[PDB]
TrEMBL record, chain B:
Residues 8-165 form the S-Me-THD N-terminal domain. Residues 181-348 form the S-Me-THD-like C-terminal domain. InterPro entries: S-Me-THD-like_C (IPR048350), S-Me-THD_C_sf (IPR024071), S-Me-THD_N (IPR010318), S-Me-THD_N_sf (IPR027479). It comes from the Bacteria. This is DUF917 domain-containing protein. Pfam families: S-Me-THD_C, S-Me-THD_N.
């Protein structure tokens, strides 16, 4: 439907970061990768073709991404791992008489769309304007791919030199954890192997055009990330109120102001104080809960997204990783500016069924065993 | 070439235990599995076809075994895991227009040959009379399959209830050995809750042509059965007799390192003979033997280090089989005097890459000296 250019990666990652609910990869590593995107030896093209789910019909699709420790990922310059993983998936599809023609980010976040875009440009594929949740999630069963029941394996993990590992999982008949969870439980340790270096490219959930539809119910996530990013980069939204206005009027999203704007205190949680009024946002990577000291129930809970907005001039959106810095352990920029916490209503496919249960389980591990209470 | 019957498994695991250099799986876990070997609902036959390496030409072969925690493994009664892993290999090969006709143990040991034999009878395959070392080994690179460059993956790990995982590894040049990398990934997978610390393993798929080169140490299964039978028929009751038997019947020039002597209570095993003391160091397999009075070890891997308890009854024990309820030892151990015997390594183990693999292992245990063949 449309195409991306190198200059579109900056606003894209910005918007995606805000839709990442605190997780989804740091803008730092996203910028590191985007800085080298330009036609040349490595990238045969400068343009990235992006198609809608209903257009992705001339071949099969696969989810592609980076997985592992951010510390290691923040050092990457080129996406060798993801490119190599997607190539393994393409080769397998070729051996089965099919053509790999599409890649897709697993979730919404600074890295997700960028990685998928770079891989597509590198292999001559098209990236789907969609992802598994419309937000960033701590684990695989929270993505629509898992709910739709797309076989998770063969899964491909790849290094930056040429190391490639394949993983296949067959669960025994129900008598039992989610197959997605099991796969994730086995993939992550493999990346701790010296050959990987705590991170690596991932390629899984290969799909035929038939599976795509039900597998990707949350759509237009890449384009909305780009539209918001452009407005951010252009300085059209410098206040929490302006962010809510933009979301409502331009993206038809009714976000809720959970707290602030207040001051971010020095540090998995981040605290904000508004004069004898404390708010604590709990996160694994992604923010999952927001607590007001004075209330027995949380302000918001996943699947609803929880995102920060730092008012003033400069970077307005940050992932939890991006907030960490050299000042008081906080980024020197955030130190001194008023920050707010915004909740975004989860997209419909996440608000019920297996995905919701998956979220309840994750939250249960974090101590919240109440029901899902839509901010909307 | 020949068939095994249920009554042949006891002798087999006993003789194999002795050629296990202290490791290769416990005799108790091996006995748990063999005790249930009979035609019935699980096994379609009481026979186990065993073939020579140059005789295994009617199809491909694959290494098969149990991997993981001894505590969890010795609780099993049927080789579901290895059987399922072998099955996954057969269908992969079949999907590629090839036939899986054989299985082979990875090493000599109480569990090795027994698991391979039960898998074979279960799936209608034959077991190859050989293993990758002629002894039990601590890690994959010390096996001839690794030295031969047989691709390790696809590797299949299977649980006892239907769980089946596949691992594939393709590396780049110019880093460790692929065997080592594969093992470092295979093991953590088994610690996953779905596996419960252990599992069945099928890897190093081979064509008849690859089999030959990959398996230079041969006749180890029948070699194990031959000794085990001798042990069971009361033909060898002393270390002296054992040394004699190995020489006359198996053409093996063994060496008495220490004893007969008494065992100690509290990975090391100590023996005391009057004023002298011998300590055998082990992970699972015994790797070094020390005499408190000598600055150099009495023996070192690749040479096998094995025990022989004199008297009537059980003469062979893996390090794991010695742990008991008496003084921390097996009730029947303490009362009798035991000896430590070293078996010269098979030629393929005392040279090239496999030798260096043994050196690195030994180094991590403190011994940075060179290999000194007992023979």
């Amino acid at each position: 439907a449309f195409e991306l250019s190198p200059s579109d990666l900056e606003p894209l990652l910005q918007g995606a970061c805000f839709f990442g609910s605190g997780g989804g990869g740091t803008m730092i590593s996203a910028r590191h990768l985007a800085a080298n995107f330009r036609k040349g030896d490595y990238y045969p093209t400068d343009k990235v073709r992006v198609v809608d789910v209903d257009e992705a019909t001339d071949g099969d699709c696969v989810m592609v991404a980076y997985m592992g420790a951010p510390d290691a990922i923040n050092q990457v310059q080129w996406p060798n791992g993801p490119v190599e993983a997607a190539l393994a998936a393409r080769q397998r599809l070729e051996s089965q008489g099919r053509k790999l023609a599409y890649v897709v980010a697993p979730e919404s976040g600074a890295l997700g769309f960028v990685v998928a875009s770079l891989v597509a440009a590198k292999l001559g594929l098209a990236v789907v304007d969609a992802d598994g949740a419309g937000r960033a999630v701590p684990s695989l069963p929270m993505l629509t791919y898992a709910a739709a029941g797309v076989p998770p394996t063969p899964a491909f993990l790849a290094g930056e030199s040429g190391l490639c590992v394949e993983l296949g999982v067959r669960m025994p008949p129900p008598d039992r954890e989610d197959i997605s969870t099991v796969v994730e439980q086995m993939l992550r340790p493999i990346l701790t192997n010296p050959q990987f270096g705590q991170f690596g490219g991932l390629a899984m959930w290969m799909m035929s055009p038939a599976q795509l539809g039900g597998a990707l119910p949350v759509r237009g996530t890449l384009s909305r990330a780009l539209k918001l990013g452009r407005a951010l980069q252009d300085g059209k939204v410098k206040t929490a109120e302006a962010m809510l206005d933009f979301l409502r009027r331009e993206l038809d999203i009714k976000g809720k102001l959970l707290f602030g704007p207040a001051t971010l205190a020095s540090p998995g949680k981040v605290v904000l104080e508004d004069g004898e009024r404390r708010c604590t946002v709990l996160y694994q990577n992604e923010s999952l809960l927001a607590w007001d000291s004075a209330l027995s129930h949380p302000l918001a809970t996943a699947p609803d997204a929880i995102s920060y907005f730092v008012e003033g001039e400069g970077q307005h959106v940050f992932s939890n990783g991006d907030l960490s810095g050299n000042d008081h352990g906080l980024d020197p920029s955030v130190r001194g500016r008023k920050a707010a916490v915004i909740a975004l209503p989860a997209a419909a496919p996440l608000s019920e069924g297996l995905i919701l249960q998956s979220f309840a389980d994750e939250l249960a591990q974090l101590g919240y065993l109440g029901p899902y209470a839509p901010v909307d």
